[PDB]
Design a protein around this ligand. Structure first.
Ligand SMILES: O=C(O)[C@H]1O[C@@H](Oc2ccc([N+](=O)[O-])cc2)[C@H](O)[C@@H](O)[C@@H]1O
Ligand SMILES: O=C(O)[C@H]1O[C@@H](Oc2ccc([N+](=O)[O-])cc2)[C@H](O)[C@@H](O)[C@@H]1O
Lengths: 192, 192
């Protein structure tokens, strides 16, 4: 599977594209630079990624997948609120260049309608899973009943990316009051 | 004041730089492009802005100032929570290119320690005003007493930029549940 070509080559290209985009931004990175960084000729590269847009699309889908691993399945062994607090803390401990690239894509999205639509699909898929977990907690009497789950998930996502986008978030999350304060915020959101 | 040179020229340059940065990003915009966009020769431009960094510094200070206008003075005629809900809604109705540029600077900050420090100064100045308003509400029995005001302001700022960075925020804020849901989130944050 993961060791059957062209998957290794594709993933290597994506690693090189992730590094170029994170260091210099999407706009200023050319395909030639990605060729030079990945050691792949234009011919080979274009067989696997015909455009810069195809590369960022695959990256956004990877980011989407990482987010879904947290919420795809029903929670077992932790309350919803506690899990969300821990998830936000974990966000701050992730690969820094990966976080830098998430913000770069957010920025490109504001000025690139094609990238914005990719992010809309991403947030939709994450929101769906969050609402699914809000439903479980509600059916188990964990969260309030009169909660706009869709809007709550959108606002949780906003807070999450705001934290992801703040260079001092890893330091903030070292403080116990980050968890404590975030918990009051989220229990109010989900009316606990 | 505002009509005494070089202020008009400086502000025109900043408008042109705001547009170039928002449309193409900070990294890919050269001073020559800013010269061409503002109609100012390199000589004149460099007298007022010696570097790209000087331009983004002035822009960040403008953004900082806009934020402080909301929280610099004690609130009169509205509760803290209601004011914060309305502030977040207003954020979604602001100049779109201005919002795009805020996110671009957030992105550059992740990968440019010099820009990150500018943003640290910005958030510090905004946090100070928020804490000042949290203090007033607390002395007036409006918000809870056991609130980490510093951490609460940091997390409010994160949510605010997360909303500012979401292209669908203007649509979300057209829904009454955006205000309602945001209000529960913030009353939990400030333990009301
Ligand atoms: O979406 C993304 O780009 C990021 O998602 C993160 O997971 C989430 C955790 C909590 C919430 N939340 O509380 O809303 C949303 C998402 C992944 O850890 C990160 O690798 C990825 O970059
Ligand atoms: O900081 C910034 O760049 C932005 O600040 C905005 O004002 C704020 C409102 C509410 C909160 N909050 O609830 O934390 C923080 C800031 C200005 O409307 C916007 O023009 C500027 O771009």
């Amino acid at each position: 599977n993961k060791l059957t070509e062209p998957l290794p080559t594709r993933m290597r290209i994506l690693r090189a594209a992730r590094q170029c985009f994170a260091e210099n931004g999407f706009h200023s990175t050319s395909m030639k630079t990605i060729c030079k960084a990945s050691d792949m000729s234009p011919g080979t590269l274009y067989h696997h990624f015909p455009s810069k847009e195809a590369l960022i699309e695959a990256i956004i889908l990877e980011d989407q997948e990482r987010a879904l691993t947290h919420f795809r399945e029903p929670l077992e062994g932790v309350g919803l609120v506690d899990y969300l607090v821990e998830s936000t803390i974990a966000v701050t401990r992730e690969d820094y260049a990966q976080r830098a690239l998430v913000v770069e894509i957010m920025a490109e999205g504001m000025r690139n309608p094609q990238v914005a639509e990719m992010l809309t699909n991403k947030y939709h898929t994450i929101i769906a899973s969050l609402v699914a977990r809000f439903n479980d907690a509600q059916a188990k009497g964990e969260i309030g009943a009169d909660v706009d789950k869709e809007m709550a998930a959108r606002l949780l996502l906003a807070t999450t990316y705001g934290v992801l986008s703040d260079s001092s978030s890893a330091e903030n999350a070292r403080h116990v009051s980050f968890a404590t304060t975030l918990r009051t915020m989220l229990t109010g959101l989900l009316k606990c």
